[PDB]
Amino acid sequence: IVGGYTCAANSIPYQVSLNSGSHFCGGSLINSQWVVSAAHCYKSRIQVRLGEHNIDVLEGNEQFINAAKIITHPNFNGNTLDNDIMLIKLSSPATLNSRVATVSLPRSCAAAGTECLISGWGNTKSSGSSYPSLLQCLKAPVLSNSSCKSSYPGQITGNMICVGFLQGGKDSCQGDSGGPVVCNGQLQGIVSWGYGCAQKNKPGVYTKVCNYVNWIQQTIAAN
């Protein structure tokens, strides 16, 4: 997260870190056994870390649970990143408590202008690299479908939304993939891609979660 702030303790109880030796993507806890993340974060072995704030220090609130099922969207396209969403079923249910809680799936798509909260342990620099120990947060609005498509001609499908600032300076970045965009308390986006990070007229592009609520429910119901 470039241009954000260190999240408070107790904030973002639904955030998870996907770890395969090192943190490489985030995700969101949507019920005690299932995590949603980006399909390009797929790896055959994933440990999910819940209740994390400082990813470099064991603070004593963490739950580390291995992924049992790892299901990418049937129509995920690795080249275009269309349908970039994956479900992970934990090998054991998470203990929901103070520090670990779930986020709701959207009841409707978010309108342009809705303010959202984006979070992650990704790069905090647009030029260079600085990877934070503490979870970073960013408040940013959903951009109109027209501003998003004009920022990235011929690359935005109906399954993608732009969230951010056309002016740049504040954006998600490498290491934030798969993480949450929560607007009005509902999960509306998944960190997916962009050109660089925090560049002028290149806002982050996120998977539009309100298109997949029935696929998520059916997949959870079947597994």
């Binding site: 090192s22 943190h23 490489f24 993507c25 980006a38 390009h40 974060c41 690795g78 080249n79 275009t80 990143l81 990704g122 790069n123 690299s129 990877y131 690359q155 998600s172 970045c173 490498q174 290491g175 934030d176 993939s177 798969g178 960190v191 997916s192 891609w193 962009g194 050109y195 660089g196 990070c197 982050g204």
Partner: peptide
């Protein structure tokens, strides 16, 4: 260039996804 926001180390550009390039040992 379309570059997924996954953290990934690399030694060559070919190690990275989509249009990401290897910028000093990491894809971006």
């Amino acid at each position: 260039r379309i570059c997924p926001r996954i953290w990934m180390e690399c030694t060559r550009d070919s190690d990275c996804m989509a249009k990401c390039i290897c910028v000093a040992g990491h894809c971006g």
